[PDB]
Amino acid sequence: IAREDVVLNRILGEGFFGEVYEGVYTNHKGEKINVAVKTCKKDCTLDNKEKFMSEAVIMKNLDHPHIVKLIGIIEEEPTWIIMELYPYGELGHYLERNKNSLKVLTLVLYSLQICKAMAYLESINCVHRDIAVRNILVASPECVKLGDFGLSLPIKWMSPESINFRRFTTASDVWMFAVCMWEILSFGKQPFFWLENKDVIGVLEKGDRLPKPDLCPPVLYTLMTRCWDYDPSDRPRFTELVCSLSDVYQMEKDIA
Numbered sequence: 001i002a003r004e005d006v007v008l009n010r011i012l013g014e015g016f017f018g019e020v021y022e023g024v025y026t027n028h029k030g031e032k033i034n035v036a037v038k039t040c041k042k043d044c045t046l047d048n049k050e051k052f053m054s055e056a057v058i059m060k061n062l063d064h065p066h067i068v069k070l071i072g073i074i075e076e077e078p079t080w081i082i083m084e085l086y087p088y089g090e091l092g093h094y095l096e097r098n099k100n101s102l103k104v105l106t107l108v109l110y111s112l113q114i115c116k117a118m119a120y121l122e123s124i125n126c127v128h129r130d131i132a133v134r135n136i137l138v139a140s141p142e143c144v145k146l147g148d149f150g151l152s153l154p155i156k157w158m159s160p161e162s163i164n165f166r167r168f169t170t171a172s173d174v175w176m177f178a179v180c181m182w183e184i185l186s187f188g189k190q191p192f193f194w195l196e197n198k199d200v201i202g203v204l205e206k207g208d209r210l211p212k213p214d215l216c217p218p219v220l221y222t223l224m225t226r227c228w229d230y231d232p233s234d235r236p237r238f239t240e241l242v243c244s245l246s247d248v249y250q251m252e253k254d255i256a
């Protein structure tokens with residue numbers, strides 16, 4: 001990927017190692033691809049420059065249909081990591097904007113797609129630690145992609161073991177994933193929006209849970225409740241949750 005083939009438009013935000021730019025990449029075909037161009041401050045340590053590159057190293061190896069895509073890497077100074085963006089933006093903003101036209105089967109489709117992405121990460125014992133609708137992009141009205149645009153706390157999405165002891169496992173991600181589904185079925189509503197972060201653990205310890213979103217099928221809410229078991233061992237694996245969500249999707253397809 002050549003630097004002249006990438007035009008920068010505006011600052012997307014500040015990453016951990018430097019600014020992230022929203023740009024456009026013109027390929028060999030001439031078609032314009034929306035991209036996020038991640039940069040690293042010059043004054044960083046070699047250790048910090050290495051940690052910056054690890055995203056390019058890992059992301060190059062990821063090719064899952066429901067995971068964000070790496071477009072390329074420009075190693076020559078200033079080093080850029082180019083990731084694909086889509087014009088439909090974040091899922092949270094997309095859900096809010098299309099709340100009146102989106103059908104429940106589509107919300108179950110998105111839930112299943114993220115579950116498939118997470119079942120793959122589970123296969124390689126990798127933990128996301130920040131499963132939330134803000135970390136999901138809309139590739140098309142029928143395709144969502146999981147990413148990680150956060151800085152390595154998201155209290156309102158975290159399992160009790162993550163809040164209490166900073167323990168993060170695949171089991172804790174399963175909890176976060178059900179919170180992500182609650183956001184999808186609620187059309188982008190923030191979980192526990194009515195609480196402060198300090199109040200969350202007290203409510204979970206007492207046995208209180210996020211209520212069923214109006215449009216959420218009872219079977220899907222039961223699955224959400226199993227992911228929110230205080231005991232991490234009693235939550236399903238993403239691998240089996242794919243089977244569970246595929247059954248829910250087929251029942252919703254049969255209803256619609």
Ligand SMILES: Cc1ccc(-n2nc(C(C)(C)C)cc2NC(=O)Nc2cccc3cc(C(=O)NC(C)C)[nH]c23)cc1
Binds near residue numbers: 054146149
């Ligand atoms: C070090 C490290 C960091 C992250 C990851 N990692 N792991 C995964 C899973 C495998 C899905 C968990 C995905 C990712 N990376 C991305 O999704 N990158 C990405 C893609 C598209 C756009 C943006 C914007 C930013 C950004 O920094 N925006 C600031 C403005 C905050 N990042 C983007 C791996 C290693």
